Design a protein around this ligand. Structure first.
Ligand code: CU
Ligand code: CU
Ligand code: CU
Ligand code: CU1
Ligand code: CU1
Ligand code: CU1
Lengths: 336, 337, 336
C-alpha cells in the first residue's frame, strides 16, 4: 500500500480493557483493512504479588501486568499512541513481535518521562504475538518487571481448524504469565524498595540464577481465582490466549483439554488437537480453543506443578451447567 | 450413551504389569466399546533411587514409580478401583489427563487411608496421557514423590502415520521419568527420614529451587540397565511411551531416531518424523515409534546430558542382529596418526 | 545398494569453513549419491568467553566452538577423518545424531591423543542434526566444554514449504549455542586451571545446578555482534541453522520472524510458519527461513532475555536496503 492508500483507509478507535478480559472485537473482519488505533499510558507502580505482601516495582503498560490484549485482523494497521508520563522515572519503548522492522518498533518508540510517540505497523501475519518493552542495555529488567503483553492478529475470515472448518469462540480470555525475581534478605525475607532503580542491582543478581521466586498469572499469586476466576458454561467455546515474554510455560486446563491448540501462536500453522498440556516458549504467545463439557471448578496451570502450586502459576475457571455422567461418573464414592 | 447402554456394554478386567512393560492389549480394537476395569492399590513405601542407597518416601500407584500404563481404546470407558490402604498415612486421589470433568477425576476420588473409590470415565480422545495424584494443597509434593503414571488410549483402528498408513508396533515400552528433590545435609549428603511427613518441609525447599537432585527412569538411576535393559532386534518396531508429570524432558535414542513421534502424545495430531530429539513438556506423555536397523547397545536419554549422565536419566537397549555397514562403517579404526 | 555400487560412488573432499559461515554447497543435489569426505582436527585450548577474561578449557572440533557445519544431501555418505593430535590430553570421539548405529558413531571413533579414525555413515534422513563428542562416562563434560556442532542433510531436491513450493535461500548461517558452567571461588570470581582435567570436579558441581554461567553463540559473549554481525539485504532469503547439544533454546529474530521454521530440524516434518519465537530442545538443531523486509540492525537471541542479555545469547544482523513505511512507520517521533 502507498502512503495515500493508507491515509484513505477507515480508522477505528479501540478502548482497551484490563486482562484477562479482551476489548470488543469481531472474529471475522468487518470490511476491508483499517488503521486500528490504541493508546497506552505506561505506569511505574508497586504491585503486591503474594499473600506475604511481597512487592515488585512493576513497569506496566496501561497500569496492568500483563499489558492489555490488542486485537486486529491480518493486514490491518496497528497504530499505537504510547505515553510515558512525567511521573515515571525511566525511559521505555515497545517491541511488537507481530511487527517487522526497527526491532519490532523498539527503535522508533524510545520515550523518556514526559514524552509520547505514535507507531504504526502493518499486521501482516495472523496469530497471537508477544509485545514488550526493551530499552537497550536494560531489556530483561523491564520485561521481568511486568512490562509485556500480547496482541492477536485474527485471520480476516476468523479462526479455522487445520482442515478449513470454522472455529468460533463464545468467550476469549488473555492469561499473561510472569516470572518475577524478588531479592531476599539474610533471613529469606523479601526486600522492599522505595524506587525502581533502587531494586536494580539486587534484582539482576536473582535474575542471573534463572530461578524465579514467583511465577504468576495477571501479576500476582491467586490473581485469576475467586473474584477473578474466569467463567464459562457447558457447551461454551472458549479461546485462552497465553503469553510468556521471558520464560517457557506449559499450560494445562485441569479437568479439560485444548481441543485445538495453536501452540506456536500462529494461525497459519495448523493447530494441534486433543492436547493435555501444551508448550509455549519464553518470548511467545499461544492460544487454545476448548468447548466445556462439564460444569464445576477447573484449575488452569503452568504444568510444572511446583511452578503452579508453590510459585503461583494457577488460575481457576468456574463453569455452570449440567453434569455429564457418560463422560465421567463416581461408580463408588470414597468409602471404607 | 445412556446409563442403560453403558450397563449393557461388555466388561473386561485387566491385570496390570509393572513398567516398563505394558499389559496385554490389541492395537486395533476388538469389537465395540467396552468398560475396561483396572485396580490399583496405593503404597507409601521407602524406595532407593541410586546406587548410593539414597531413599525417597515414594507414593506409588500399584507399588511402582511410575505407576503402570493402562491401555484402552477410544470411546471405551476406563473404570478404576483405587484403594488407599489403612497402612498409608495420607489422603490420595487420581487425576487422569485423559478424562473430562472434576479435575480429571481428582475431585471424585479423594480417599483417606482405609478407603477405596471407583471412577469411570469415557476415553474420548486418542493418545498417551499422564495420570497423577493431586490432593488440593499438596499437589506437587505427591507428584514428585513418584505418584504419577500414564495411560494409552489407542484409536479403535490402531495407530496410523500422518497420512493414513497403518503403523503396527512389535513391542511397546513405557518409560516414566521422575524428577526427585532430595534434601541434603551440610556435608551435601542426602538426608533420610522416618515417615513421609518428616521430609515435607526440607523437600519443599529443594522443590522451590526447581533443580532436581535426581532425574530417573522407572524410579531409579540405572533402573533400565543391565538385566533390566530394554531389548529389541534389527527390524523390530518399537513404540516407546514416555511421560513426565511435572517437568520437561527431551527424549533421544542414542544411535537411533524417532521415526514417527507424537511429541504432544495425541494421535489425532500428526506425528513429527525422523526425529533426533523430541520434546515432552512437564504434565504430558509422548510416544515414539522406531524400527531398529543396527544391533548393539543404545542409550535412551533425556538429552540434557547433565540430566542424563549426572542426574540419572539414561536407560539402555540391547539389540540383536546383523551389523549394517551400508548405514555405518569404521573405514579406519582408531589408530596412530 | 550392493557392495560394488557403494564402492563405485564418487568420493568428494570438501573444505570446511568456521561458523557462522558454511562451506559452499548446492541446495539441489548435483548428480547421484556421493561419499562426501571431511577432516577435522580436535583442539584442546583455553578460550576467553567474556569481557572479564573468563577462561574455558575448550574441546573444539576443527578448533572452533561450535564445530563447523558439514552439509550433504539425503542418501549421500558422510565420511569423516577425525584426528586427535598427541599434544591433546583427553580421549575424544564423535556421535552424529544424523547417523544410525554404534551410539551415532561414538562407539567406533574413540581416539586417544596421537590417534585418528575414519567413520562413514549413510545420511538417510533429511534435516539439520547435532553432532557431539561423547566419551563414555564423561559425555556432558565434553559437550559443555564446546565439543559439539551440527550437520545439514539437505533433501536431494532442496528445501520446500508445506505445500511443495521450493524454498531457496540466498545465504545460510550456522549459530551454535553453548551453555558453559564456569566454576567460581567463594568471592564470585571465575576460576582458572592449568589443565582441563583440573577443572573437572569443580565444573561438574556447577553443571549439576543446571544453571549455566554463560550462554553464548559462536563460543563467546558478543561473538556475533558489532563488527562480527551477520549480514543480509532487504529481499534476501536467509536460512539460520541453530543448534544446542545439551540445553533448550528459544531463538527469536528481533524485528523479524521465522517465515518457515523446521523447529524439529527435520525437513520431512512440515515447517511451522510466521514464527515469532521457535523452540529447539537440548540435543537438537533447528532451521529458520526468513526473507528480510526492512533494513537496519536486528538482534537474534535466545528469548529467555536473561540468557540473551545477561548471560550472552545475543547476535546481530546488519541489513542493508530501503525502509518500508507500509510495514512500519513512526507517525510521531518521541516528543515532549
Ligand atoms: Cu521480544
Ligand atoms: Cu495434571
Ligand atoms: Cu547426543
Ligand atoms: Cu520499560
Ligand atoms: Cu497422593
Ligand atoms: Cu571430546
Amino acid at each position: 500500500a502507498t502512503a495515500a492508500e493508507i491515509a484513505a483507509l477507515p480508522r477505528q478507535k479501540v478502548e482497551l480493557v484490563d486482562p484477562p478480559f479482551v476489548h470488543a472485537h469481531s472474529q471475522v473482519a468487518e470490511g476491508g483493512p483499517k488503521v486500528v488505533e490504541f493508546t497506552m499510558v505506561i505506569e511505574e507502580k508497586k504491585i503486591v504479588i503474594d499473600d506475604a505482601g511481597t512487592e515488585v516495582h512493576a513497569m506496566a503498560f496501561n497500569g496492568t501486568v500483563p499489558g492489555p490484549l490488542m486485537v486486529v485482523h491480518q493486514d490491518d494497521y496497528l497504530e499505537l499512541t504510547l505515553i510515558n508520563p512525567e511521573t515515571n522515572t525511566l525511559m521505555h519503548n515497545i517491541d511488537f513481535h507481530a511487527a517487522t522492522g526497527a526491532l519490532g518498533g523498539g527503535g522508533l518508540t524510545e520515550i523518556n518521562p514526559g514524552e509520547k510517540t505514535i507507531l504504526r505497523f502493518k499486521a501482516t501475519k495472523p496469530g497471537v504475538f508477544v509485545y514488550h518493552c526493551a530499552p537497550p542495555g536494560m531489556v530483561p529488567w523491564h520485561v521481568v518487571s511486568g512490562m509485556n503483553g500480547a496482541i492477536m492478529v485474527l485471520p480476516r475470515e476468523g479462526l479455522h481448524d487445520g482442515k478449513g472448518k470454522a472455529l468460533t469462540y463464545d468467550k476469549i480470555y488473555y492469561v499473561g504469565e510472569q516470572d518475577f525475581y524478588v531479592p531476599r534478605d539474610e533471613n529469606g525475607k523479601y526486600k522492599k524498595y522505595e524506587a525502581p532503580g533502587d531494586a536494580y542491582e539486587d534484582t539482576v543478581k536473582v535474575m542471573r540464577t534463572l530461578t524465579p521466586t514467583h511465577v504468576v498469572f495477571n501479576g500476582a499469586v491467586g490473581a485469576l481465582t475467586g473474584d477473578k476466576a474466569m467463567t464459562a458454561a457447558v457447551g461454551e467455546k472458549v479461546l485462552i490466549v497465553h503469553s510468556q515474554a521471558n520464560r517457557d510455560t506449559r499450560p494445562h486446563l485441569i479437568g479439560g483439554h485444548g481441543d485445538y491448540v495453536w501452540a506456536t501462536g500462529k494461525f497459519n500453522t495448523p493447530p494441534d488437537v486433543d492436547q493435555e498440556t501444551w508448550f509455549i516458549p519464553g518470548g511467545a504467545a499461544g492460544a487454545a480453543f476448548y468447548t466445556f463439557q462439564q460444569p464445576g471448578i477447573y484449575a488452569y496451570v503452568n504444568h510444572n506443578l511446583i511452578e503452579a502450586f508453590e510459585l503461583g502459576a494457577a488460575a481457576h475457571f468456574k463453569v455452570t451447567g449440567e453434569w455429564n455422567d457418560d463422560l465421567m461418573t463416581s461408580v463408588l464414592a470414597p468409602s471404607g
